[PDB]
């Protein structure tokens, strides 16, 4: 009979994608929207809620129509899974189904102010005060001190709290409630995990920290697994109520990077993924048991497939210069034009000779926390080229990455069985070398570049039965979308004189205010 | 009254050229010949004597030739003027007129050996031993070490100072010689001040240095001034007498720094030049008393005009890399295309916002000799550009003079009235405001820019009575040639900032060994 076919919302931090698998697993429509990365202020960014929305909706009706064009048996989906940037917070109010303000972006510095105070009174003095409940340090970066700042700083936010209409919710679940035409509020495991108000154990939201944050928890969804009926697709925005024909249920939901974990297979105790974007963040799936870190790392949900399934935790560490590095060697620094230069001038060169480059442009984070941290190249002679300092770069990633997994080894204790990574310098050959004898693991690289998108397809299919357990999704994947293996072929001197090098080298990167 | 003509023999590292000035002191012909540039053995660095001898003869004819196709009032040239890469040594013999074999350059590091000996056996473990005496530490640059190798390791100049007929010289000496046809055998002040024989306060050999480093005094040339009779042009190797046609006395021998000096007119206690080629050279008049350096600055003579006449002292400082860093950005970097754009980037931008290069690619010299410094480039961000770090290396030059010159100033106890510049880095208008806001002193920059071969010309002028005063010479230079002042405009926090940075990059740069 026909094909039963599964819908991936992938929502980044740059653009919305709507993505229709097979059964094979297989990308076989896909649309894409950007939208407007606001700036209103130094260190400030926001995205327009309803531009986003919009952009899904989009997204959808354009991908759906051109599948019919490819299979014009096609006539529904089986069910939607959404993927989606975390922490970004929408702030909404319930009656008018309107956001009150612009989304403020996970990556967005505005909260500072407040993520001072939170250490300051309710941790006294430490930001790991609350880790062992979230898994988390006071940062930025997670949506509860978002939500506090809409609260202290917009009026329409503190209106709608004030009379009790206000809805606070990660990107999940503004989708899951404008898809719904404002009938679901729910959201999933891995997302409710990034707001520093659920206790990541236990995944239920922590009455404790909502009142010390002055969050009330009125206004908080319903937390629910990544694979299981969220709501159903209830809006004509833009025709897709129309475009799905059969009413189609939300089936699945996830936060981008474990969703990348998932779409990658990373089942087992010791499986890893490296999203490759600006930065990379790496997750490792540390099994049934929530590991916490003594070594700057987070703790985060991994997955949870089902309400009573087992809860799969995960450990993630950042880097937030690896795509943005060799793009600033082009743009900014003139040595090279095309991105095909890049590998063939770090290749034309049989070392560093000498040097190292920290590509520290943001600070080190990493493991090693220190926003003091700039760029620098140390050991400079009269021989060093751009073709060196280019394979310095490499090697700079590839160390920083070492680092991290050093640590999650540690945080864990549990080795690193394979690293699965995607993305734009997944291309890099090069660095994938330097990468797996570095590290001393098998580096794997998709030929199918959806599988972010295919996490939160997977989490949907499972939940509306196109497949049947995770050993059918492994078997469909290894017969369907082949992939390309990087052995380690470096020795054991070469691996530790390189990480003593750079830890010489580390000592100078101090530049700070 | 007719028009009077002065010659200059610019004996170089890599080249030789005759120059030919008018009473007016603007070139008026010019012809460059090279000469082969020998590396028998890693780090070292030969140069063929009689080859030198033909290229300053095929230099003078034809420029001679040159001048008067195009200028009818020419006829003969009234006195030469030699200037002369310095500390390179020549030793040849008396009855043959020949070398014995190749002369080590100044940066030649065979003597390094040697260089530890003296030190050990004779200093102590103190390489400043003599430096009351001779204004020098023991270092392979100066003449006495390149000596003492020959002795030791040429079996010709050994075999030769046994007869009696071994002669060494600096390359002033070695074409008095040659020029003379065998009858002069003098070296100027300035040179012999590089020999590490000379004592700075009698400005004669001395006895004990030639006893203890075991150079015999039969060897030595006579010591005479800068500006005086030291011979006659009394050979026809390549046709010169005859292009001379006239008989023409050789009345000027300066060191190529100290005729810079000179031809930059720094006739003056406090009056400085410096010289931005591939490197720096600094060198200040310092009086008629010397001034000695706690900071491994040379004390050195700069000029004495007429036998027995006032001799004006001078320190000195160097960088290695200047011009040096400015091609290695655009060759091995790919930072520009060609020379005009290093200017051009560098002042797109209102300042190098954070970053500091240190382009110590061989080490720091200057008050803070370390040989273990490095290449180094610290504070970088995403903002940074190309532009910010060719910015950054005309800083770094301008800012290694200014710890240079402070450094000066407070062992000469005088004060910088004012920089006169030369070289063709001093043709960057950038690198000039940044030096005159830095040093804050006017800087000079002549529009006539042949200073090195001026200074000879000067002296030999001086002798000849072309030009009867250090007075007249100024009136003359200030009514025919124009100067460019460059005054200090920066801001007191913006200097405070730029040296306050330049401080925390310079502790950051210890890397090799
Ligand atoms: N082996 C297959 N079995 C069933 N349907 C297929 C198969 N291969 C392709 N299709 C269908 O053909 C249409 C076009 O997809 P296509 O771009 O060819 O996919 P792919 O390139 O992954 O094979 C899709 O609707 C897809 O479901
Ligand atoms: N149910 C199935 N759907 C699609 N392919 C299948 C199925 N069962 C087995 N296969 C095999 O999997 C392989 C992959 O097919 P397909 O995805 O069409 O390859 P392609 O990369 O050319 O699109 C084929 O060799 C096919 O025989
Ligand atoms: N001390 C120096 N004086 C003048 N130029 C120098 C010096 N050192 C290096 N240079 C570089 O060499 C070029 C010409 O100098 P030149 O006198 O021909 O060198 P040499 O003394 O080796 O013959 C200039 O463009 C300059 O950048
Ligand atoms: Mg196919």
């Given at each position: 009979?026909?094909?039963?076919?599964?819908?991936?919302?992938?929502?980044?931090?740059?653009?919305?994608?709507?993505?229709?698998?097979?059964?094979?697993?297989?990308?076989?429509?896909?649309?894409?929207?950007?939208?407007?990365?606001?700036?209103?202020?130094?260190?400030?960014?926001?995205?327009?809620?309803?531009?986003?929305?919009?952009?899904?909706?989009?997204?959808?009706?354009?991908?759906?129509?051109?599948?019919?064009?490819?299979?014009?048996?096609?006539?529904?989906?089986?069910?939607?899974?959404?993927?989606?940037?975390?922490?970004?917070?929408?702030?909404?109010?319930?009656?008018?189904?309107?956001?009150?303000?612009?989304?403020?972006?996970?990556?967005?510095?505005?909260?500072?102010?407040?993520?001072?105070?939170?250490?300051?009174?309710?941790?006294?003095?430490?930001?790991?005060?609350?880790?062992?409940?979230?898994?988390?340090?006071?940062?930025?970066?997670?949506?509860?001190?978002?939500?506090?700042?809409?609260?202290?700083?917009?009026?329409?936010?503190?209106?709608?709290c004030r009379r009790g209409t206000?809805?606070?919710?990660?990107?999940?679940?503004?989708?899951?409630?404008?898809?719904?035409?404002?009938?679901?509020?729910?959201?999933?495991?891995?997302?409710?995990?990034?707001?520093?108000?659920?206790?990541?154990?236990?995944?239920?939201?922590?009455?404790?920290?909502?009142?010390?944050?002055?969050?009330?928890?009125?206004?908080?969804?319903?937390?629910?697994?990544?694979?299981?009926?969220?709501?159903?697709?209830?809006?004509?925005?833009?025709?897709?109520?129309?475009?799905?024909?059969?009413?189609?249920?939300?089936?699945?939901?996830?936060?981008?990077?474990?969703?990348?974990?998932?779409?990658?297979?990373?089942?087992?105790?010791?499986?890893?993924?490296?999203?490759?974007?600006?930065?990379?963040?790496?997750?490792?799936?540390?099994?049934?048991?929530?590991?916490?870190?003594?070594?700057?790392?987070?703790?985060?949900?991994?997955?949870?497939?089902?309400?009573?399934?087992?809860?799969?935790?995960?450990?993630?560490?950042?880097?937030?210069?690896?795509?943005?590095?060799?793009?600033?060697?082009?743009?900014?620094?003139?040595?090279?034009?095309?991105?095909?230069?890049?590998?063939?001038?770090?290749?034309?060169?049989?070392?560093?000779?000498?040097?190292?480059?920290?590509?520290?442009?943001?600070?080190?984070?990493?493991?090693?926390?220190?926003?003091?941290?700039?760029?620098?190249?140390?050991?400079?002679?009269?021989?060093?080229?751009?073709?060196?300092?280019?394979?310095?770069?490499?090697?700079?990633?590839?160390?920083?990455?070492?680092?991290?997994?050093?640590?999650?080894?540690?945080?864990?204790?549990?080795?690193?069985?394979?690293?699965?990574?995607?993305?734009?310098?997944?291309?890099?050959?090069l660095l994938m070398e330097i990468?797996?004898?570095?590290?001393?693991?098998?580096?794997?690289?998709?030929?199918?570049?959806?599988?972010?998108?295919?996490?939160?397809?997977?989490?949907?299919?499972?939940?509306?039965?196109?497949?049947?357990?995770?050993?059918?999704?492994?078997?469909?994947?290894?017969?369907?979308?082949?992939?390309?293996?990087?052995?380690?072929?470096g020795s054991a001197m070469e691996?530790?004189?390189?990480?003593?090098?750079?830890?010489?080298?580390?000592?100078?990167?101090?530049?700070?205010?």
């Amino acid at each position: 009979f026909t094909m039963k076919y599964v819908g991936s919302i992938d929502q980044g931090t740059t653009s919305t994608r709507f993505i229709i698998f097979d059964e094979r697993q297989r990308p076989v429509s896909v649309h894409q929207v950007p939208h407007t990365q606001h700036t209103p202020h130094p260190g400030w960014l926001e995205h327009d809620p309803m531009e986003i929305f919009r952009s899904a909706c989009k997204c959808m009706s354009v991908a759906i129509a051109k599948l019919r064009q490819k299979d014009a048996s096609f006539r529904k989906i089986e069910a939607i899974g959404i993927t989606n940037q975390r922490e970004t917070t929408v702030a909404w109010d319930r009656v008018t189904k309107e956001p009150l303000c612009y989304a403020p972006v996970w990556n967005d510095l505005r909260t500072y102010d407040i993520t001072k105070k939170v250490t300051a009174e309710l941790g006294g003095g430490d930001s790991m005060f609350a880790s062992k409940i979230t898994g988390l340090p006071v940062s930025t970066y997670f949506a509860a001190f978002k939500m506090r700042w809409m609260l202290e700083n917009v009026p329409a936010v503190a209106d709608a709290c004030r009379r009790g209409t206000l809805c606070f919710g990660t990107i999940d679940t503004w989708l899951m409630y404008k898809l719904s035409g404002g009938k679901a509020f729910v959201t999933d495991v891995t997302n409710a995990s990034r707001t520093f108000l659920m206790d990541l154990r236990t995944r239920k939201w922590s009455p404790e920290l909502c009142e010390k944050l002055k969050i009330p928890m009125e206004t908080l969804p319903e937390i629910r697994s990544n694979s299981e009926l969220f709501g159903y697709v209830e809006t004509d925005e833009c025709g897709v109520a129309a475009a799905l024909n059969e009413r189609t249920p939300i089936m699945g939901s996830i936060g981008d990077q474990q969703s990348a974990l998932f779409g990658n297979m990373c089942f087992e105790k010791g499986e890893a993924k490296n999203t490759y974007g600006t930065g990379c963040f790496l997750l490792m799936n540390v099994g049934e048991e929530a590991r916490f870190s003594k070594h700057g790392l987070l703790s985060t949900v991994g997955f949870q497939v089902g309400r009573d399934g087992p809860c799969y935790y995960a450990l993630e560490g950042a880097i937030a210069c690896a795509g943005a590095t060799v793009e600033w060697m082009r743009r900014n620094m003139n040595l090279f034009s095309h991105i095909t230069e890049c590998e063939k001038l770090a290749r034309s060169v049989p070392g560093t000779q000498g040097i190292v480059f920290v590509p520290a442009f943001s600070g080190l984070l990493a493991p090693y926390w220190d926003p003091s941290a700039r760029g620098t190249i140390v050991g400079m002679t009269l021989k060093t080229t751009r073709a060196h300092v280019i394979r310095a770069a490499l090697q700079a990633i590839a160390l920083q990455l070492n680092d991290v997994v050093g640590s999650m080894k540690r945080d864990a204790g549990l080795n690193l069985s394979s690293l699965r990574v995607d993305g734009g310098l997944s291309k890099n050959g090069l660095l994938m070398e330097i990468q797996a004898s570095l590290l001393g693991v098998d580096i794997l690289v998709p030929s199918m570049h959806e599988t972010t998108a295919l996490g939160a397809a997977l989490c949907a299919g499972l939940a509306a039965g196109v497949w049947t357990s995770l050993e059918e999704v492994k078997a469909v994947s290894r017969r369907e979308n082949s992939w390309k293996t990087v052995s380690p072929s470096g020795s054991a001197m070469e691996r530790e004189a390189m990480i003593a090098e750079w830890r010489e080298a580390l000592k100078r990167t101090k530049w700070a205010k």
